[PDB]
Paper text:
In archaea and eukaryotes, the evolutionarily conserved KEOPS is composed of four core subunits―Kae1, Bud32, Cgi121 and Pcc1, and a fifth Gon7/Pcc2 that is found in fungi and metazoa. KEOPS cooperates with Sua5/YRDC to catalyze the biosynthesis of tRNA N6-threonylcarbamoyladenosine (t6A), an essential modification needed for fitness of cellular organisms. We show that A. thaliana KEOPS is composed of KAE1, BUD32, CGI121 and PCC1, which adopts a conserved overall arrangement. PCC1 dimerization leads to a KEOPS dimer that is needed for an active t6A-catalytic KEOPS–tRNA assembly.
Alternatively, a mixture of freshly purified AtKEOPS and AttRNAArgCCU (at a molar ratio of 1:2) was applied to cryo-EM grids for structural analysis. With 232 232 picks, we determined a map of AtKEOPS at an overall resolution of 3.2–5.5 Å. The reconstruction shows six KEOPS subunits―KAE1, PCC1, PCC1, KAE1, BUD32 and CGI121, but no presence of a tRNA molecule. The dissociation of BUD32–CGI121 from KAE1–PCC1 in one KEOPS protomer was probably due to the structural damage at air–water interface during sample preparation. Imposing local refinement, we managed to determine almost a complete structure of AtKEOPS complex with exception for the C-terminal tail of KAE1 (residues 341–353), N-terminal end (residues 1–13) and C-terminal tail (residues 222–226) of BUD32, and N-terminal end of PCC1 (residues 1–15). We modelled a Fe2+ ion in the binding sphere of H113–H117–D298 motif in KAE1 based on crystal structures of Kae1/OSGEP proteins. The final model is composed of a complete AtKEOPS protomer (PCC1–KAE1–BUD32–CGI121) and an incomplete protomer that only contains KAE1–PCC1. In the reconstructed model of AtKEOPS dimer, the two protomers interact via an interacting interface of PCC1 dimer and adopt a V-shaped architecture. In general, the C-lobe of AtBUD32 is located farther away (at least 4 Å) than that of MjBud32 from the C-terminal domain of KAE1. Our structure shows a distance of ∽25 Å between Arg220 of BUD32 and t6A-catalytic site of KAE1.
Residue numbers in the entry:
A (entry chain C): 2 to 172
B (entry chain A): 4 to 340
C (entry chain D): 16 to 94
D (entry chain B): 14 to 221
E (entry chain F): 16 to 92
F (entry chain E): 3 to 339
The structure:
């Protein structure tokens, strides 16, 4: 699905469950064999499309001012969703590891052909963008993001995640 | 017309002011106990200087004003705050003058005198008033008939901070260490980092002074910066911080005009920054001048004139000078009426 | 312990009473360490001051003579 | 443009396809360039930290959407609700509903106690500040511009004193709420004794 | 014109007599402008200064208080 | 048994307490000095304050160093004069109190005789004619029929006063003494300037010489024609010539064998050198003690007090007065006869 962003940009999203070649995906990301730019995130750490849209806005601002701290804009995105100042730990935890078969593949202003060929490249089951609440791993969200029980009683998990993503640079 | 006489001796500066109701000084022989360079003032020798000078000073005030003692409507002494000995000398002389001339003694506060003199000089009706001096660093707003303070140093005043920083650097003492610091800073060209030290609606200067002393001592021997740069950076930092504080004061009480009074008001950088802020926020800073902002008897006499023509008075048996006398205790009956 | 009385002769009764009353209203900073009382007789102003210690006594009399000199100068200027 | 603050500005726009508000701390001209950059960055970090901490204490606040470091902007969720001042004006004009007033006083007292026990003052607890969410009647707090962190009970007492002074200033058309708010704070707080001692001390200071 | 009459506390009579025979036998600076008399009763001094001018009397006060403290600090051992 | 007499010296800003034995040995000589701002002379009041501060510790140090209990002290000696009234009266009060507590007789002692006798017992001289030249004394003393009679002296001012006044004119430092700075600057002198010859008969005058050389110093420093070193050289050589000439005339008149010199001004080296040369020419010896005795101190007075007491002449406790001029000839020697 393609969703609009700021200043007329768009982003294409595709959720896949039961990925069988996750190790091959990680190897290709490491060696850069794939020609198209794409980011793979551990989709279990996502409660809603809204935090991803916020990270997309952050990466768009970084690219527009050409302030991509990481080598690629998609790696900039995956580092952005982590909310930590340590790039290596961010990639290890929030980026895909060898134990993530529930993978989100996204691209910036992607054409339908690019998403179709990406879907051809992946051996998995495509899922919509509404099961996140059902598949959100809230326990590790509270563990990593230090979300208080008082926070949960006045707001949802996604709002706290979005606030932390925004306020990373405030620390 | 109505004329009030006021005595000011709360600091090393001594003043015998004689004023009318319009705000125009008739005479103002102001004298200073000129301390040796590198040294401050102590109550005993300051009192000795006052003993030697006040009678010639009062004679000079009478000769300059040419106003008969009977023409005085009220004789007013600065109750304080300030060091005990000069206020005590002023108390004795005002008691004697009241019992001889048969004239009413009025205790007058100092900050109220500064605010009223500034307001009458610049014609402002009800602005936030910033009184900055050697022993005072105050942001004051009228409220419910009382001059409530909203911005205040908790540890040490900005003027004392400048003074003993200059003494650390051993500046001259004419006409004031602040003036010499300003002259030195006029050649300052380099900025220097100072920590953020504004909390709530108040500022602390003792930590700021300690930090700038440490930096100056570290940089002078290492020739990393000139004292001019140190003075300029300190001046800009403190005045930007005071801009922030008085802007918060503007927001809280919803005030538009701005008045500046006190010794540091003799400077011009404060006026430039304040007028810039007023232009940004559609305000109108009112300017300053030396004869209407330095410690002397004119402002004291003017506040006394207000208090006497309003009705408040103090008997001769109640001529109890105080080392501490807050501004809010003065019930501003003049403005409500 | 330590104490004495001092006299000053004025032109008339009025000046003695003025000095008496003007210095009378002057409170004492430390009532627990020094004490002052006084009498007036014709133009003679007698001031009985009593202090506990010698240094405090000397300082008190020094200040007292100073303020007496102030009063005398003021009266002579405005007799 | 919605409103311009004394030190910053608030703007209306759309973030991530959602209705949003933009609180932009545009560079003021009272600071030198390096000085301005330093204070803007530091106070932006402080505001974000204050929002995070007040969220951690179970007090409802607008949700922080995104932070642009190279533009000094705050993006916040838009909240639908009613102001306390409007409700109190309605009480004064058309009659005070005692049960609604008591519930509002209890809720605001509980929220104030919850924020106060965390050792973080607010300083601007004015009726224009807190809102009540429509439909859910839930209390929310905004405008962290003057928030300062300290453990001194003096600050909490000063905050309560300013709150009651503002309540007096907005006229007693809705009646006297000092008793209700004090009882709510007593029933909600645990260190209320020292806070009320310091509040009484501040009250005697300000009465003169 | 100006005068003062010190009456001073002392433990024993001989201390007052010592102060007498020490200070009184000394001849003061100038009889023209000032007069001084001193007497002893029991262990109590009675020391009267009379002077034309208060500043001269105060200088005498300084000298007398200092020398009396000196005598006490000498006797105390 | 070595009977011990406790003595004081306070004739000047130098405060001293002395304990001596029959042979002149000093069991304890504690002493203290007062410093003055340059270009001015010390005033009596602050000098008396310093004396009051330092008198008790000096006696304490004397009793500690001598290791002699105050009971073992046999009599008390007070310096009758000459000297300033305030320190003399302080010493008189202290000696009177000590005598009343310890029950020891009091004796009044002169200062010049003390100088003469201590120099005699130090240098081993038999009975020489003595020139005492200092800041307060400039005289020639010779023993005759039990009286230390005066043969030659200054007629206008002691040359110590002239030297100190010219040093103040030249703005020389008072540390450690203006005389030492004058001597060193003269040692740096290069040019000699003529001065008036003001020797009347066999005595000397210095007021006219001082005025002339002050005028010359002002003219030459104004025109930068010479350095102050040349001025000091000229003054030193001229005054040395005058003093040694009158010393020679007195020596010839008195018909003696050897001559003794004493005084702070006697600390100079050019004098002692050239005058010992001319004494060797005159078949005479030079006696010149160290600077420790040339300056005033208590052990100076103590030995003459011991000499007076051992004979049996006493002094009533009521006559413990002082004078501005306690002339040497008024004391009749009884110990030598
Ligand atoms: Fe002032």
């Amino acid at each position: 699905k393609v969703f609009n962003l700021d200043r007329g940009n768009t982003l294409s999203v595709s959720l896949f469950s039961g990925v069988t070649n996750s190790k091959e995906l990680l190897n290709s990301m490491l060696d850069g064999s794939l020609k198209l730019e794409v980011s793979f995130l551990n989709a279990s750490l996502i409660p809603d499309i809204f935090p991803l849209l916020a990270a997309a806005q952050k990466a768009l601002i970084s690219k527009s001012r050409d302030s991509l701290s990481t080598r690629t804009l998609h790696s900039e995105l995956v580092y952005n969703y982590s909310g930590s100042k340590h790039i290596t730990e961010s990639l290890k935890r929030c980026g895909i590891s060898e134990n993530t078969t529930y993978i989100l593949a996204a691209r910036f202003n992607a054409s339908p052909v690019e998403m179709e060929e990406v879907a051809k490249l992946i051996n998995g089951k495509e899922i919509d963008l509404e099961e996140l609440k059902t598949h959100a791993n809230q326990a590790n969200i509270l563990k990593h993001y230090k979300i208080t029980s008082q926070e949960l009683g006045i707001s949802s998990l996604g709002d706290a995640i979005v606030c932390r993503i925004a306020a990373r640079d405030a620390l | 017309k109505m004329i009030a006489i006021g005595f000011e001796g709360s600091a090393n500066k001594i003043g015998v002011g004689i004023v009318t109701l319009d705000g125009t000084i008739l005479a103002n022989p102001r004298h200073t106990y000129i301390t040796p360079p590198g040294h401050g003032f102590l109550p005993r020798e300051t009192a000795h200087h006052h003993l030697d000078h006040v009678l010639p000073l009062v004679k000079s005030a009478l000769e300059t004003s040419q106003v008969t003692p009977e023409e005085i409507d009220c004789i007013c002494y600065t109750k304080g705050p300030g060091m005990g000995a000069p206020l005590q000398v002023s108390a004795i002389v005002v008691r004697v003058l009241s019992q001889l001339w048969k004239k009413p003694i009025v205790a007058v506060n100092h900050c109220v005198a500064h605010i009223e003199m500034g307001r009458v000089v610049t014609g402002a009706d009800d602005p936030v008033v910033l009184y900055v001096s050697g022993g005072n660093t105050q942001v004051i707003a009228y409220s419910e008939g009382r001059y409530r303070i909203f911005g205040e140093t908790i540890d040490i005043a900005v003027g004392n901070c400048l003074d003993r920083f200059a003494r650390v650097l051993k500046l001259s003492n004419d006409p004031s260490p602040g003036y010499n610091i300003e002259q030195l800073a006029k050649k300052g060209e380099n900025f220097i980092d100072l920590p953020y030290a504004v909390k709530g609606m108040d500022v602390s200067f003792s930590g700021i002074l300690s930090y700038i002393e440490t930096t100056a001592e570290e940089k002078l021997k290492n020739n990393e910066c000139t004292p001019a740069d140190l003075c300029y950076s300190l001046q800009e930092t403190v005045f930007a911080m005071l801009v922030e504080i008085t802007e918060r004061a503007m927001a809280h009480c919803d005030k538009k005009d701005v008045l500046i009074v006190g010794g540091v008001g003799c400077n011009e950088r404060l006026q430039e920054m304040m007028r810039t802020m007023c232009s940004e926020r559609d305000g109108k800073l009112f300017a300053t001048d030396d004869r209407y902002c330095i410690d002397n008897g004119a402002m004291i006499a003017y506040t006394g004139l207000l208090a006497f023509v309003n009705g408040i008075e103090t008997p001769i048996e109640d001529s109890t000078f105080t080392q501490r006398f807050r501004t809010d205790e003065v019930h501003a009956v003049w403005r409500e009426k | 312990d330590f104490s004495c009385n001092l006299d000053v002769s004025f032109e008339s009764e009025e000046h003695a009473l003025i000095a008496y009353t003007s210095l009378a209203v002057d409170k004492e900073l430390q009532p627990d360490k020094v004490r002052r009382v006084m009498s007036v007789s014709n133009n003679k102003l007698s001031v009985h001051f009593e202090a506990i210690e010698a240094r405090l006594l000397r300082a008190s009399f020094s200040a007292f003579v100073d303020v007496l000199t102030l009063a005398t100068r003021t009266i002579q200027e405005f007799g | 443009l919605i409103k311009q603050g004394a030190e910053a500005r608030v703007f209306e726009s759309t973030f991530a396809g959602r209705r949003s508000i933009v609180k932009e701390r545009f560079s003021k001209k009272y600071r030198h360039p390096i000085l301005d950059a330093k204070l803007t960055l530091k106070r932006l970090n402080a505001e974000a930290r204050c929002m995070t901490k007040a969220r951690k204490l179970g007090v409802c606040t607008p949700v922080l959407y995104a932070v642009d470091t190279l533009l000094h902007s705050l993006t916040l969720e838009y909240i639908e609700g009613v102001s306390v001042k409007d409700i109190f004006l309605e009480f004064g004009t058309n009659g005070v509903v005692e049960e609604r007033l008591d519930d509002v006083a209890a809720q605001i007292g509980a929220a104030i106690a919850k924020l106060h026990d965390g050792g973080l003052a607010h300083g601007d607890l004015t009726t224009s500040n807190m809102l009540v969410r429509s439909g859910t009647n839930q209390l929310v707090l905004i405008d962290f511009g003057l928030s300062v962190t300290s453990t001194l009970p003096e600050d909490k007492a000063v905050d309560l004193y300013v709150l009651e002074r503002a309540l007096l200033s907005m006229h007693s058309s809705c009646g006297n709420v000092m008793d209700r708010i004090l009882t709510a704070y007593r029933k909600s707080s645990k260190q209320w004794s020292a806070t009320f001692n310091k509040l009484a001390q501040v009250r005697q200071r300000g009465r003169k």
